[PDB]
Amino acid sequence: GAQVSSQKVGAHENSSTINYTTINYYKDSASNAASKQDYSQDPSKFTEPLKDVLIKTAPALN
C-alpha cells in the first residue's frame, strides 16, 4: 500500500527527481495526513459571472 510521489525540489544539493513515500496506517480517512497536491481552478465564477461573456478587446457595453 506504499504510495510514492515526487517532491517539488526547491534548493538543490551539489549531487534530477526526488521522491517521498507515504503509507496510511488507519482505516478511517479522517485519520489521514493532508496530501497537499492540490488542483487549482478558474476565477471566472467570481470574476466574470456574466450571462453573455465578452472578450476583453471588444466594448463591455454595446
Binding site: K8, N32, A33, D38, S40
Partner: protein, 279 residues
C-alpha cells in the same frame, strides 16, 4: 507543473481594440494583463500559487481554547476538580477570521492537546505524575456532576487518557455535520413564532443560532486522587482543519468580534487617516 502563466512579448499598438476601457457595472472584473496596455518582454514564469491553496492556508494548528482544571482535596464549595468546554472555533479570534472568508466549509478536524501544570502554593510536600482524562460528551449523553461520578466510566463516549510530560495528545475527527457542509453563517432561526402560541416565549430563538448544543462538549479532569498540596493545570486545545473544501467567499471581519454572531459593538473605525494626495 503548477507555475503561473508566462508573460508574452508584446509590441506597439494603433487599433480599434481597446482592452483598457471597460464597464464595471456589468458585475465583472476586467481580465487584463501587462501586455494589454504596455510593451512587454517574454518572461518564462516559474512562480506558483502552491502555498495559497485552501489546504495550505488552513494547514496550521491554531489555539481555540484554554481549559483550566484543578487537582486538590474535595472541599464542599465550588471548585474546578473537573471542567467542561463547548466545542467551537469562536472563543478565539484568529482561526475564526480565517474560516470566515467563506460561507460554507467541509473538513476533517485534527485536535492536539498541550497540557501544562504548576504548584499553586509555596509548600505542602509534592505531587506524583498526573494522568488527565479528556472525555467527549456528544449532545444527549449524561454530563458529569462530580469529578469521579459514573459518567467518567466512558463506555461509549470517546475518551483520551493523557500522561503528564508525554508528547501532546492528538486525535482525528471526521466531517460530523448534520448538513452537507458546515455553515459559518446562518441567516435564520431554530423556531418560528406562530399566531396561535400561548406565551410569545414559546417561539422565541436566538438569531443566527441553529442547534442548542451544536457539537457537544469536552469534559476534562485529573484522574489522580488529590495530593496534600494543590496542583493547577491548563489544557490548551489546538485545532487544525484538514482535507478542507470551502464555498461562497465573504469579506473578512473588519471590526472586533462581539460574541458568536455577526454583532459589532465598538472600535467601528478600522481605517487610518491619510491625505488624498499623499503617498
Amino acid at each position: 507543473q503548477d507555475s503561473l502563466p508566462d508573460t508574452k512579448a508584446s509590441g506597439p499598438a494603433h487599433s480599434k481594440e481597446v482592452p483598457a476601457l471597460t464597464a464595471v457595472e456589468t458585475g465583472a472584473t476586467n481580465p487584463l494583463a501587462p501586455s494589454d496596455t504596455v510593451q512587454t518582454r517574454h518572461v518564462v514564469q516559474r512562480r506558483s500559487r502552491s502555498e495559497s491553496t485552501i489546504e495550505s492556508f488552513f494547514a496550521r494548528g491554531a489555539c481555540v481554547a484554554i481549559i483550566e482544571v484543578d487537582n486538590e482535596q474535595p472541599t464542599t464549595r465550588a471548585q474546578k476538580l473537573f471542567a467542561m468546554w463547548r466545542i467551537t472555533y469562536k472563543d478565539t479570534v484568529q482561526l475564526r477570521r480565517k474560516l470566515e472568508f467563506f460561507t460554507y466549509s467541509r473538513f476533517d478536524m485534527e485536535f492536539t492537546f498541550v497540557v501544562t501544570a504548576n504548584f499553586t502554593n509555596a509548600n505542602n510536600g509534592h505531587a506524583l505524575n498526573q494522568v488527565y482524562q479528556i472525555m467527549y460528551i456528544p449532545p444527549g449523553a449524561p454530563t458529569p456532576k462530580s469529578w469521579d461520578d459514573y459518567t467518567w466510566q466512558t463506555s461509549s463516549n470517546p475518551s483520551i487518557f493523557y500522561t503528564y510530560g508525554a508528547a501532546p495528545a492528538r486525535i482525528s475527527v471526521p466531517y460530523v455535520g448534520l448538513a452537507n457542509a458546515y455553515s459559518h453563517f446562518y441567516d435564520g432561526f431554530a423556531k418560528v413564532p406562530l399566531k396561535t402560541d400561548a406565551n410569545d416565549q414559546i417561539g422565541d430563538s436566538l438569531y443566527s443560532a441553529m442547534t442548542v448544543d451544536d457539537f457537544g462538549v469536552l469534559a476534562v479532569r485529573v484522574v489522580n486522587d488529590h495530593n496534600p498540596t494543590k496542583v493547577t493545570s491548563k489544557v490548551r486545545i489546538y485545532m487544525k482543519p484538514k482535507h478542507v473544501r470551502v464555498w461562497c467567499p465573504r469579506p473578512p471581519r473588519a471590526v472586533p468580534y462581539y460574541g458568536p454572531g455577526v454583532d459589532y459593538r465598538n472600535n467601528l473605525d478600522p481605517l487610518s487617516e491619510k491625505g488624498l494626495t499623499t503617498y
